[PDB]
């Protein structure tokens, strides 16, 4: 029971599966699409201190990954290099074939130390971390991501109507993921 949205005449209605209204025509798997949309586009605060308050560490929950075929240009991506004060890794290395988000104007690269009190870092509002055509529930080390969400669509029969430089800003942080966290941008 996941909302499947069917495009009508220049409109999007989520087709209700309990009833069966046949005027929708799906003649091929090419009409099926998954799309990633950025939370940025809804007006959420993008400042680093604001963004990092949405993430938190937790033990006991296995991570999960789901693919998507098409995405949105992001203005802001993030890239984390966080270690414990003795010097240890609190973010797991990217598995084979998880690469960074393809298109973002700004990559905010944050380095520093924190308590990292948990095995994996999750999104407190339940959104996803978007990578190159793979959305994950957790943050990987040293890999640029965007915050976003996934939708599934039945596209219309006509193909045609539907479907580069980057900069890095560096920050140092102490007490990352705490009530008061110290950042200095270089």
């Amino acid at each position: 029971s996941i909302p499947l949205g069917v495009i009508h005449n220049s409109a999007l209605q989520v087709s209700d599966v309990d009833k069966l209204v046949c005027r929708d025509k799906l003649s091929s798997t090419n009409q099926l699409r998954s799309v990633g949309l950025n939370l940025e586009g809804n007006g959420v605060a993008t400042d680093v201190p604001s963004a990092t308050k949405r993430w938190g560490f937790r033990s006991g929950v296995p991570p999960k990954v789901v693919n998507y075929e098409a995405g949105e240009w992001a203005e802001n991506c993030y890239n984390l290099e966080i270690k414990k004060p003795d010097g240890s890794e609190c973010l797991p290395a990217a598995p084979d074939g998880i690469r960074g988000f393809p298109r973002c104007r700004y990559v905010h690269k944050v380095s520093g130390t924190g308590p990292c009190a948990g095995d994996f870092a999750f999104h407190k509002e339940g959104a996803f971390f978007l990578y190159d055509r793979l959305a994950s529930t957790v943050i990987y080390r040293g890999t640029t991501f965007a915050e976003g969400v996934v939708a599934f669509l039945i596209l219309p029969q006509a193909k045609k109507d539907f479907f580069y430089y980057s900069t890095t800003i560096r920050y140092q942080a102490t007490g990352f993921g705490t009530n008061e966290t110290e950042y200095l941008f270089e």
Partner: antibody, heavy 122, light 110 residues
């Protein structure tokens, strides 16, 4: 694994001394190094830390000792150095170098601290 | 925000004792590990407990510990003559720019 710290000697108040901690037996280049001290009769104190080259290479210092001590390292000689200058009284203590991350599969005890070098100011 | 510790603890041979280390909401309850060191008179500290629960190879299982709220405990059961030492608890302060903080130390006697 060995940490050998040397260069502690009697010093007149206001003078300068240099301490070295030569490491062997482990991946020196991938560890964070700390200097701590213990004054006679009292407990342990932390003076400073230096990070690995791969993580910035920056140094932090405790508030009493900041601006008078400088910590550095040389990965070509595997040596940690603490330069003490403007050595005003109240710095008398045994100094120790502490090595890296505590998370070791097989390192075991007696592999994280040295033996201790006595520095007296008089 | 500096960790506290009792001046000294005592106990009969063969029994269990616990050493308390009490911190603050920025030190232990913020999610940082607590380490325990044993300094025998005349020598240098050796690592006894690291990462709140872990023991390095070679340390007897008589030594353990735990963390709760803003405090931590070290439990040693079966006191032997060789256990006389000064014990220190350590953690990372989060309001002091992630700098080491040490406990006052507790002397053990048998």
């Amino acid at each position: 694994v060995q940490l050998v710290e040397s260069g502690g000697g009697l010093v007149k108040p206001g003078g300068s001394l240099r301490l070295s901690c030569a490491a062997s037996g482990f991946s020196f280049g991938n560890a964070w190094m700390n200097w701590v001290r213990q004054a006679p009769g009292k407990g342990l104190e932390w003076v400073g830390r230096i990070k690995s080259k791969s993580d910035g290479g920056t140094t932090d210092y405790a508030a009493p000792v900041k601006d008078r001590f400088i910590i550095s390292r040389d990965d070509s000689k595997k040596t940690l150095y603490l330069q003490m200058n403007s050595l005003r009284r109240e710095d008398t203590a045994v100094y120790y170098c502490v090595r890296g991350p505590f998370y070791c599969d097989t390192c075991g005890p007696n592999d994280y601290w040295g033996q201790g070098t006595l520095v007296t100011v008089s | 925000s500096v960790l506290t510790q009792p001046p000294s603890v005592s106990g009969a041979p063969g029994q269990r004792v616990t050493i308390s280390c009490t911190g603050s909401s920025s030190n232990i309850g913020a999610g940082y590990d607590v380490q325990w060191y044993q300094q025998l008179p005349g020598t240098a500290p050796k690592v006894l407990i690291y990462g709140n629960n872990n023991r390095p190879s070679g340390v007897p299982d008589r030594f353990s510990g735990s963390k709760s709220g803003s405090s931590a405990s070290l439990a040693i059961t079966g006191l032997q003559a060789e256990d006389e030492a000064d014990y220190y608890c350590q953690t990372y302060d989060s309001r002091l720019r992630d700098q080491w903080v040490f406990g006052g130390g507790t002397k053990l006697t048998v």
